[PDB]
């Protein structure tokens, strides 16, 4: 939800690809 | 039981503050490791459950992405740490006042 709040689910990994496949 | 329960409420509050402090210190010390998720415990709900009773920690939402996968934000963690320390000292003062009053009653 709002950043800084508490949620039960974890966070998905952050991926920053150089070029879109 | 009477004295036991009356002191037990504040004792459990103080213990929960201590455990939350431990979790905050852990996730501050581990703030520079990729793949780590910031953890915290819902203090109010946990205290309510314990009062009528092994803690159920839950993840914290990120605020801005990082490539390495770190979600702990130092400023927010520092503010939470300061708040928890102040709450711990407040609970300590309240407990000490109650105990000192109880001791002084017997005089």
């Amino acid at each position: 939800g709002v950043p800084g709040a508490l949620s039960n689910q974890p966070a998905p990994p952050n991926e920053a690809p150089i070029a879109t496949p | 039981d009477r004295l036991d329960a009356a002191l037990r409420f504040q004792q459990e509050a103080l213990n929960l503050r201590a455990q939350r402090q431990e979790i905050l210190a852990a996730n501050i010390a581990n703030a520079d490791t990729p793949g780590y998720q910031a953890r915290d415990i819902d203090f109010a709900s946990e205290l309510k459950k314990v009062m009528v009773r092994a803690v159920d920690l839950l993840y914290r939402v990120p605020d801005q992405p990082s490539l390495d996968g770190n979600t702990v934000d130092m400023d927010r963690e520092r503010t939470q740490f300061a708040d928890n320390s102040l709450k711990y000292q407040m609970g300590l003062t309240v407990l000490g006042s109650q105990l000192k009053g109880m001791m002084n009653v017997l005089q």
């Binding site: - | 201590a18 431990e22 852990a26 501050i28 010390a29 581990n30 703030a31 490791t33 000292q89």
Partner: protein, 127 residues
Amino acid sequence: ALLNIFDIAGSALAAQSKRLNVAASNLANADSVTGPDGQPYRAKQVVFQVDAATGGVKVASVIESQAPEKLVYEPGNPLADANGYVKMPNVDVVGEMVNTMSASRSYQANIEVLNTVKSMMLKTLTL
């Protein structure tokens, strides 16, 4: 409790000290193309781990970087291969420069946390 805080902060301090030492060593050997056994110097990095829930940090091992080794052309040195190329260390400079600052800042934060927790425990002692 609060006794685990000392262990956690000590582990964090040790890990940050290892990272700082590795960065300093890389900066020092950034331009040393040889080794005692003839192998070229290669940049090294530590690996962090969580030592079992939550907990402190630990340094599992130090591993050589897999980035390609920069190589220059000079036939004079006996270390040159069949094509006259020698292998300079592939150690970045600005990366180590920012690693030093990050390690120092994390070290300061951890020691401040340790001092705060020690003060809180001392105040608790006189309940």
